[model samples]
Target: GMKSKILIFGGTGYIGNHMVKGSLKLGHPTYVFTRPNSSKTTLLDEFQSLGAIIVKGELDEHEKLVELMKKVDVVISALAFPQILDQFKILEAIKVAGNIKRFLPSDFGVEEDRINALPPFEALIERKRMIRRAIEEANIPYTYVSANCFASYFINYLLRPYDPKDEITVYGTGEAKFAMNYEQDIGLYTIKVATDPRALNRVVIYRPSTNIITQLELISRWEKKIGKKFKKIHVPEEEIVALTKELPEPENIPIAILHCLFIDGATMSYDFKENDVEASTLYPELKFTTIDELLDIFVHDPPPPASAAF
Candidate 1:
């Protein structure tokens, strides 16, 4: 397959950075769309070294985006917005971005679009539907990747509030399971979908070889790795809901609802295999990072400490 120039939105984000690197590694001409306000200090070295073109444009600036899109073969969105409703703005931009060969939407997490079993997150899935409908209506080639829970983000979120010596909070019974994938692997798989003709107009779900582990299983692994047991506390869903209602800030409701669904089996259980025919063919070298491997680098061997805060 011939590689195409890829334009990535939100290229400074966690997964976006990886996607930019993956696209450059494949010898494709990579460009990133960023706002004037976006901080490029962290990304400067990569942009300079890899020769990634940075176009100044925000998602709301449809005119500028359309002008820029005319130069690229495909557009990959890694854009993240606080409100789900904001996806409509991105959809509108894509619709006007001219005859783009491929458009990859900003769906980096679970297969929320396919998981009809969970009604609580129906709004989240509906937002995706709106975008997909708009894309199809425009007769543009599209590919959606159903990446079940980002492995690195999930682990980091769970561990962020706790020190190695402190107690960590567990959301549910700790036995519920969910598929996980390293962000880099997800990025690589996404790049393949954008460039490969075989992956055109498809939803590719990629998972590395591993069974979903429970919260308890994760804790056990951590304990084994650190040679110490951390305190575990369980909170009931009803209690959490009651507390959430007391404050009821719009910003927190989505996250609160997500937790409720997870406990109720929203993010758990699946029959999909990792070695599916399309994934095997498109991303044959897609080796995913495991929990153990992540632990060794992020936990046992930590990155350099940050400079002291004032």
Candidate 2:
């Protein structure tokens, strides 16, 4: 059982950074591909400190990309949402190298093929779908991760557990359930998926039982953890729907996504298909931080306040 050599694109990003650490921790010969312009970032220095090989090049650098691909057994793209289309170049390079044992495209939010949302959010999902189709048509060996909502991001938005606010905004009914995962758990499970034979050509669904919860349920738990209940400010379903239409670009995008996950309940809407594999079941030995535990962590070590836009 030799560890696969892993190459991660966008390794300096939020999710990608964790993926890089996961690969290295799993004892893979981790190689991180980052933009040449990002050489000065402390994150890159951290990756180097962790013994990940750093390769610098643009995705459009065809020859360099292919050359880089030839050096690895697995390729995981943690590219940000804005660069969803940029994955095509990586796909082409993988096709050129013709040796990647597992290729994971950045389908880390909800399962794109199963859910439909407002135009702004659907546009993003469509791009992800395009990449999935491209990978399949190119006949590349691949793994698609349905990681659902990131715990820290969504939790901060929903509860703002760190911020001592008297009232918390409630979207829709606040009872629509969604799946969530801590970033570190996502990274570890992702590396496990990338290297495991069971995950090849399958969709690894990340819906741990403890991670699936409704907004109201999450808020109630935070209330218990903090020893006080804050007033709940309700944002009805129509308001969310209207925001999807009325809000400008980028702002409307997250609103539309909120509509999909919270209002529409997209995360748990579909049952797993034959090609789908539940990530938790595959690695029950790996302990994942539950949402309640995450809330506790926030109580003890509150993360700095996220920007208003986030």
Candidate 3:
């Protein structure tokens, strides 16, 4: 039931904002966790009006986390650690967090448990696996939402069409099939997973569309939408793998590795009939946006580039 109180960590970020809104819209009592210094601009004036209990906490502060976890029936972790270094601290805090009925980890991307498919990004998955094991050992009911690539963020930041002047570089043959979901849809699906008793202790793959398109297909869509043609360059798989190995720390790795996984079909294929279809049938209220609809919000004209903010 959406009326139950739910605690959402990192509710100020891109996807987190949507999760907060979706929960509140469903008539649930919701709270958000954020560091004291984090910005709340993402949610605008509605943050306070929505009656969200804004807690002053950080992922590293397990004691504070334990205190906050005591107040909710479900916990949704949307905190984005730039690297995998913070996994241990978050897990430690969650282990002590009281009576958490469902713990949805920050696995809003490809399925990490499917390691054989995407080796480079598997580091992130491995960290999630450790968290899952810790939750199981502690007997905390949990669910893992293995959503495919987020269309809005991925296309805007990682995909090449944004950088129009230069040639668009892609990995592999660019013919791999990958599932895509809107960020808002992910938020809705996550809340459904959080509230549903049947989804507890299971992995749900959330995808708005079962259609898998290759890199070329994605580029073709962009070309059609923008009404402009662009040059395409392909990078060899060996080069991508070699670069991944050269990165001294896992956190230093680029989003390109994950993109490569998409191109190689590692994080692409899924039996939607089993995961998303079930979620749809059980939660008929959950509506998904198609690629055409997503493209409308996504395909904005190229904007002026900004200086690196290092």
Candidate 4:
């Protein structure tokens, strides 16, 4: 815990904020790379309040990024999907800094190096793979996390439209099991691995069975708990493929990616390792959020037919 300086890119994001919290909680000197003109404020202030040092600069500010990286032993990039291509700049900056002990790329989904995702999803994963290659080619010591699905994000998304009258869409029978982890858990556990001496150049995965559930199973469980059943709307694999062609390219990237995730085996299963490098197993005391907990936040009873539409 002594002199472990952490520098983070993209601290305002859903996953990045938790990394700041986790780093500070572990007594690391945390620094966040922020833009000078970010529209957001509350999270930036909260980062400062949590004792994180804010380093304001864009990714193009290579000199500034180099200096920031030089100050920290660890660098983590949690850039969002839109910013995936932008990571090479950060990678370039890190390589120039030349003293970073560890780097964690923003690969909190399907293992990019392993999967050749169909269509729109493939492009995103390839971009991530480029980052991975960049890190390796730059001779940067790195940790790649395959944290798989994010529970809070994906659950609320899958159970969308919360209106009871709306039919719940099931992609591919909703049977592919995903190893989803709570974002907070992913951030905290990743920080632990990133800072640890053993985790440098390792592939850390967060596959706690507490979070392993099929989408269909998740829906069934939700129905059992809520005592209400939403009608199911099934979308077959062929239909999803057809939609991809009909929908506009890039604009429907999310739709394409979702189809890949729910229908094209992006939400496939995982096998656990007993070597204990896996964060969830290593940090057994840490409590993970479950489907039930996240599901409760998104839905409620339709309320007596709303008295004939106002």
User: How would you encode candidate 4's per-residue C-alpha lDDT over 1-310 as one tens digit per residue?
Assistant: 4767989888887778778898888788999989999877888888888888988888998888888777788989999877988998888878888888899998877776656666766777888888888888877898988877776667667765345564687887777767777777788888888977667777777776577787788888878766778778888878777776787766557667667667656645435444325666566567666656656554552211110000
Q: For each candidate, C-alpha RMSD in Å?
A: 4.3, 1.8, 3.7, 5.4
* lDDT per model vs. reference: 0.67, 0.87, 0.67, 0.75
- Top candidate when judged by lDDT against the true structure: 2
Error of 1 at 200 (Å): 1.9
**Per-residue CA lDDT of candidate 3, range 188-240, in tens?**
87897787877878878764444356677877787788888778888777667
The model with the greater TM-score, 2 or 3, is 2
TM-score per candidate, chains pooled: 0.84, 0.96, 0.84, 0.89
Candidate 3's error at 207, in angstroms? 2.7
Stretches of candidate 4 above 4 Å error? 1-3, 269-277, 293-310
Could you tell me how far off, in angstroms, the CA of residue 287 lies in candidate 3 after the best superposition? 2.6
Candidate 2 per-residue lDDT over residues 142-170, each given as its tens digit: 99998988888788878877677899998
On a 0 to 100 scale, what is the lDDT of residue 15 in model 4? 74
Candidate 1 backbone collisions, by pair: none
Error at 262, model 4, angstroms: 1.5
Candidate 4, TM-score vs. the true structure? 0.89
Tell me, by TM-score, which candidate is best: 2
Query: Any residue pairs clashing in model 3, and if so which?
Result: none
Per-residue lDDT of 40 in model 2 = 47
